[PDB]
């Protein structure tokens, strides 16, 4: 009912009224054996040739294959040539190929700090260290033992003290205590320092900062101590704050006089 390739052969030559000359060769190898079908067709000018392992076959080849000359030559038509897929491996791969890896590290970074030699003149100014205090002294909260007559008795005379008007030595500093404290003036005994043994002493200068009488009025004295110093210091000051003509009167209760 339908054509085979060896049947477009034969309808070819059909036309002269004659049928392809099939002229095929058995040809034995070694693994087997193999027929090669030799076609005798018109214009004979190419030699089909067809390669199957039996007769039966070797016609389907030699066939198919004069076919490629038979539709190039434009005799025969491309509708009669076999594509089929019937075997496999026919089919590779193309290949993809163009892999590229660089990279550059532009070192070109290189920097200089410019730094100059750091001069020091402020080794030269170093701060020095500063007591600020209010003054925790305030003993002018103690009174029963204020009322002793032997520290006055102990100190010296009243005789001399009567002069001054019963004012004594280390009684006197707590009254100055109060002047500081009245005037709100800021100032404290230059305790000056002395050599060591060979100079064993210290000395002492007091002043008052400018009263609202604007006066000066200081004292520069001496002691064995550096609180010897201050009790000098302070009694001195009696006579200098007497300029000024400003002093709450003492009164000293002579109890005994020895004859």
């Given at each position: 009912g339908a054509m085979d390739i060896k049947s477009f052969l034969y309808?070819?030559?059909?036309?002269?009224?004659?049928?392809?000359?099939f002229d095929i060769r058995q040809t034995g190898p070694k693994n087997r054996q193999r027929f090669l079908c030799e076609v005798r067709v018109e214009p004979n000018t190419y030699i089909g040739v067809g390669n199957s392992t039996n007769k039966k076959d070797a016609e389907k080849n030699a066939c198919r294959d004069f076919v490629n000359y038979l539709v190039r030559?434009?005799?025969?038509?491309?509708?009669?040539?076999?594509?089929?897929?019937?075997?496999?491996?026919?089919?590779?791969?193309?290949?993809?190929?163009?892999?590229?890896?660089?990279?550059?590290?532009?070192?070109?970074?290189?920097?200089?700090?410019?730094?100059?030699?750091?001069?020091?003149?402020?080794?030269?100014?170093?701060?020095?260290?500063?007591?600020?205090?209010?003054?925790?002294?305030?003993?002018?909260?103690?009174?029963?033992?204020?009322?002793q007559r032997d520290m006055n008795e102990a100190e010296a005379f009243d005789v001399n003290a009567a002069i001054h008007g019963n004012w004594t030595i280390e009684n006197a500093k707590e009254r100055l205590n109060i002047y500081k404290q009245t005037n709100n003036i800021r100032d404290d005994?230059?305790?000056?320092?002395?050599?060591?043994?060979?100079?064993?002493?210290?000395?002492?200068?007091?002043?008052?900062?400018?009263?609202?009488?604007?006066?000066?009025?200081?004292?520069?004295?001496?002691?064995?101590?550096?609180?010897?110093?201050?009790?000098?210091?302070?009694?001195?000051?009696?006579?200098?704050?007497f300029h000024l003509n400003v002093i709450e009167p003492f009164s000293g209760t002579l109890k005994k006089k020895k004859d």
């Amino acid at each position: 009912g339908a054509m085979d390739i060896k049947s477009f052969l034969y309808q070819f030559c059909a036309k002269s009224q004659i049928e392809p000359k099939f002229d095929i060769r058995q040809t034995g190898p070694k693994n087997r054996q193999r027929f090669l079908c030799e076609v005798r067709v018109e214009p004979n000018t190419y030699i089909g040739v067809g390669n199957s392992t039996n007769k039966k076959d070797a016609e389907k080849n030699a066939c198919r294959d004069f076919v490629n000359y038979l539709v190039r030559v434009g005799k025969l038509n491309t509708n009669d040539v076999p594509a089929d897929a019937g075997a496999s491996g026919g089919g590779p791969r193309t290949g993809l190929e163009g892999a590229g890896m660089a990279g550059g590290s532009g070192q070109q970074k290189r920097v200089f700090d410019g730094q100059s030699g750091p001069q020091d003149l402020g080794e030269a100014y170093r701060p020095l260290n500063h007591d600020g205090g209010d003054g925790g002294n305030r003993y002018s909260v103690i009174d029963r033992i204020q009322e002793q007559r032997d520290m006055n008795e102990a100190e010296a005379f009243d005789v001399n003290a009567a002069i001054h008007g019963n004012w004594t030595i280390e009684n006197a500093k707590e009254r100055l205590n109060i002047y500081k404290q009245t005037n709100n003036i800021r100032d404290d005994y230059k305790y000056t320092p002395v050599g060591p043994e060979h100079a064993r002493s210290f000395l002492a200068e007091l002043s008052i900062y400018v009263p609202a009488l604007n006066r000066t009025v200081t004292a520069r004295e001496s002691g064995s101590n550096k609180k010897s110093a201050s009790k000098s210091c302070a009694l001195s000051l009696v006579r200098q704050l007497f300029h000024l003509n400003v002093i709450e009167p003492f009164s000293g209760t002579l109890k005994k006089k020895k004859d």
